[PDB]
Design a protein around this ligand. Structure first.
Ligand code: HEM
Ligand SMILES: O=C(O)c1ccc(-c2ccccc2)cc1
Ligand SMILES: [Cl-]
Ligand SMILES: [Mg+2]
Length: 393
């Protein structure tokens, strides 16, 4: 009843160009079985959205990667938010929502925007730059560690640690096994920075620890919630901003529309999140036998959701393969959907908005002028190198 496919969605060939195989996965049926890894797959918008919005049936506490925490020990203690179901999920979620709230955004926006303007001005003096190392990485590194309250020393561990986290959701391929092999120094650094005395006053980490006396979390929960922000809070934004610059580089007409109305910056970034889907995949585990798209999935089965495919499903989107900065993007699943929908989305959107605003006001053209190199990760989609010439406005 359910089609079986041999496509490996974690192979380098798939990462290099996922779109034909994602169409094959969508068109095979609402639910497929991936023989390579013994998981169910859903690649259409409708079923991805339905799964994400039924956390009781499709749980997260058995892991949101291939590994089933009921079968294998996780490589690090489980996240108290990502790898938890209601009700254990609810109060940690509420604390991070208040830490990364509108009022926090109001406190950090002016500095985030100044840093974005400064970075674009600096890049314009160089002219020819690498929009990954020099922009998509450099800008979040210039604002997010400071907003966390991290000391300066050791920050070189942050991107390696996040690459490890996101590779570890994948199957036991070389990408994952090599990441785990190299992990010990990065885990050591990150775990130490999660302790209250190592987080500067006023930053996100100190705020998490300050929430430990309300009855929502206890002091022993705060280090792992800081760990959540150091896991998910940087590499995601690197690939989101890199996606937006890559889109503007490939669609000069959309750069020109953005220049003409810089208030499109926030939606131009949201559209880049839909179009590239820097977070490609999440898993769930069934807690019962369940009917989904006419297939009966047994209890205890891993289900793989193709967020990037859902975001390009023509059943849901008009001209899905077009980058359109005035698209109505509401409903895309690039930040997830439902109770686990990205709790950091306001930080992500703030960074993306102020960077695209700086580009809109200061840059007249973005021209690829060197070999583009992709960066391979089991969960994240993005580039290793994006050589561009920036022409000043
Ligand atoms: C463009 C940037 C980002 C993208 C595309 C993204 C994507 C996502 C997605 C798809 C999920 C849902 C995972 C699931 O359903 O299992 C998620 C959850 C999460 N993200 Fe983001 N994220 C981004 C930025 C950030 C930032 C900046 C932070 C923190 C500062 C962050 C922290 C988290 C956390 C803690 C969760 C778990 C929430 C929960 O389980 O309730 N993310 N993210
Ligand atoms: O450590 C955390 O809590 C954390 C790690 C990774 C993510 C993540 C985001 C999107 C997809 C998969 C995982 C979320 C939270
Ligand atoms: Cl760790
Ligand atoms: Mg068929």
């Amino acid at each position: 009843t359910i089609p079986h496919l041999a496509i490996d969605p974690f192979s380098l060939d798939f990462f290099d160009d996922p779109y034909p195989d994602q169409q094959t996965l969508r068109d095979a049926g609402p639910v497929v079985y991936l023989d390579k890894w013994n998981v169910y797959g859903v690649a259409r918008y409708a079923e991805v959205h339905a799964v994400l919005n039924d956390p009781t049936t499709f749980c997260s506490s058995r892991g949101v990667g291939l590994s089933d925490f009921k079968k294998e020990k996780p490589w690090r203690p489980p996240s108290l938010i990502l790898e938890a179901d209601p009700p254990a999920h609810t109060r940690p979620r509420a604390v991070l929502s208040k830490v990364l709230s509108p009022a926090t955004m109001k406190t950090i926006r002016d500095g985030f925007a100044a840093a974005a303007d400064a970075k674009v001005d600096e890049l314009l003096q160089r002219g020819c730059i690498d929009a990954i190392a020099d922009l998509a990485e450099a800008y979040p590194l210039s604002v997010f560690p400071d907003a966390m309250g991290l000391k300066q020393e050791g920050r070189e561990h942050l991107l390696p640690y996040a690459g490890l986290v996101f590779n570890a959701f994948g199957p036991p391929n070389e990408l994952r096994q090599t990441a785990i092999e190299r992990s010990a120094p990065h885990q050591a650094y990150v775990n130490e920075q999660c302790q209250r005395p190592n987080l500067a006053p006023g930053g996100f980490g100190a705020c998490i620890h300050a929430f430990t006396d309300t009855g929502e979390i206890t002091p022993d929960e705060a280090p792992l919630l800081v760990r959540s922000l150091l896991s998910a809070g940087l590499d995601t934004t690197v690939n989101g901003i890199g996606a937006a610059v890559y889109c503007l580089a490939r669609f000069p007409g959309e750069l020109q529309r953005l220049r003409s109305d810089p208030t499109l910056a926030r939606n131009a970034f949201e559209e880049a999140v839909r179009f590239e889907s820097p977070v490609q995949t999440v898993f769930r585990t069934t807690t019962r036998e369940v009917e989904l798209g006419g297939a009966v999935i047994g209890e205890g089965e891993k289900v793989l959701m193709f967020l990037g495919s859902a975001n390009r499903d023509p059943r849901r989107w008009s001209d899905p393969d077009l980058y359109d900065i005035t698209r109505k993007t509401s409903g895309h699943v690039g930040f997830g959907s439902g109770v686990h929908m990205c709790v950091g989305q306001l930080v992500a959107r703030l960074e993306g908005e102020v960077m695209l605003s700086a580009l809109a006001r200061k840059v007249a053209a973005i021209d690829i002028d060197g070999p583009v190199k992709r960066r391979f990760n089991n969960t994240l989609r993005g580039l290793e190198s994006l050589p561009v010439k920036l022409t000043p406005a």
